[PDB]
Design a protein around this nucleic acid. Structure first.
Ligand SMILES: Nc1ccn([C@@H]2O[C@H](COP(=O)(O)CP(=O)(O)OP(=O)(O)O)[C@@H](O)[C@H]2O)c(=O)n1
Ligand SMILES: [Mn+2]
Ligand SMILES: [Mn+2]
Length: 342
DNA sequence: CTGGGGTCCTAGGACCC
DNA sequence: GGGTCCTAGGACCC
């Protein structure tokens, strides 16, 4: 049919929760990210900091080259987690059809709700307001007939605002929309479809689908469907965690197995505790390890295995350390585990 | 000067048709 | 010629 979707997105989420519990940071540049001593990167940044040009996923070295007086915080999870619990409860009051994406996001299908006389625009306005009133944080909304447009619109108005796209607005909206804003079209593909001349949807709309399944396979279909603004994906509230990882990047590389083993001794207890919260008996499907060398190439060894076992990890890492390092430094060691199927 | 937590997609070989 | 599991890797998102 024609549904009503509401992408809610907390505005620079982890930064906002810091500014509220510490109003001193309200107007001075702040970021959450690992310190440059540790080779970290920026998670999020307040608006005083984005002035300078600091964005998420930026190396901390560069965040300070463009904003020296940047206050760097490590980050507090629950403070973000507890806040993200509340917003989800607030969604619960309006629908049960809630697809949580990350901590600050949520797709909401409201097609079958009469909370605000069946107007998605108010329901969105309500959640944004009632989140503000009880958590003292601001949120932003995107209303659309489908999932990906509701998300694009949530960044449309950006800070403490919303943006609505009706089916009559859609065909014009997609003429000028660049492929890179379509969630799932990141840097590499954006660069590639453009080597073929395709920068906006409207360029793809005049293209052939037979060939787009040649050059891109399945991804060419998804591209083609939304360059057409078709998106059948349903708001699923049932998705579960499939895997639990713990990984670490160290200040200066390591070159000897004894060091790598010393790291594994310390990340295993965290992986145990984390997996305990979900499987108190530790039964799993596969476990494995992950190295990242200095040439940034990354390798994985993982094999079917019944229960989180410390000694098999050290074993498997050691074997990977031997036959795949080629005597390069390694900047990252990590442990992984794939959950059982239920 | 490049995190840490994840998701989904691809592809070859193995296994069992 | 199948499906499906197993494994490794890559693009992508917050
Ligand atoms: N690469 C990344 C990107 C995001 N994050 C995490 O994602 C959160 C919100 O996502 P987000 O993408 O919405 C950013 P937000 O802070 O909310 O800015 P906005 O107001 O424009 O939406 C941040 O608070 C970070 O912890 C990360 O850890 N690594
Ligand atoms: Mn956000
Ligand atoms: Mn978000």
């Amino acid at each position: 049919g024609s549904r009503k979707i509401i992408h809610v997105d907390m505005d620079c989420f982890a930064a906002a929760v810091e500014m509220r519990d510490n109003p001193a940071l309200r107007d001075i540049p702040i970021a959450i990210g690992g310190s440059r001593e540790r080779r970290g990167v920026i998670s999020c940044a307040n608006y005083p900091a984005r002035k300078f040009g600091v964005r998420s996923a930026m190396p901390t070295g560069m965040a300070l080259k463009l904003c020296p007086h940047l206050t760097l915080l490590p980050g507090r999870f629950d403070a973000y987690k507890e806040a993200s619990n509340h917003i989800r409860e607030i969604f619960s009051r309006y629908t049960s059809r809630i697809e949580p994406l990350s901590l600050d996001e949520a797709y909401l299908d409201v097609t079958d709700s009469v909370h605000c006389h069946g107007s998605a625009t108010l329901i969105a306005q309500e959640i944004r307001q009632t989140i503000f009133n009880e958590l003292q944080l601001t949120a932003s909304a995107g209303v659309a007939p489908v999932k990906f447009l509701a998300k694009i619109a949530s960044d449309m108005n950006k800070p403490n605002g919303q943006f609505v796209i009706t089916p009559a607005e859609v065909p014009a909206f997609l003429q000028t929309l660049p492929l890179a804003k379509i969630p799932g079209v990141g840097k590499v593909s954006a660069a590639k479809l453009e080597a073929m001349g395709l920068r906006t949807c409207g360029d793809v709309q005049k293209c052939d689908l037979v060939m787009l399944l040649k050059r891109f396979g399945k991804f060419g279909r998804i591209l083609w469907e939304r360059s057409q603004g078709i998106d059948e994906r349903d708001v699923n509230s049932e998705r579960l965690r499939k895997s639990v990882g713990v990984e670490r990047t160290m200040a200066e590389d390591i070159h000897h197995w004894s060091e790598c083993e010393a790291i594994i001794e310390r990340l295993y207890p965290e992986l145990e505790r984390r997996l305990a919260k979900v499987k108190p008996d530790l039964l799993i499907a596969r476990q494995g390890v992950k190295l990242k060398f200095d040439d940034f190439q990354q390798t994985t060894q993982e094999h079917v295995w019944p229960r989180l076992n410390k000694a098999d990890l050290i074993a498997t890492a050691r074997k990977t350390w031997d036959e795949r390092r080629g005597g390069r430094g390694v900047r990252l060691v990590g442990l992984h585990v794939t959950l059982l199927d239920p």
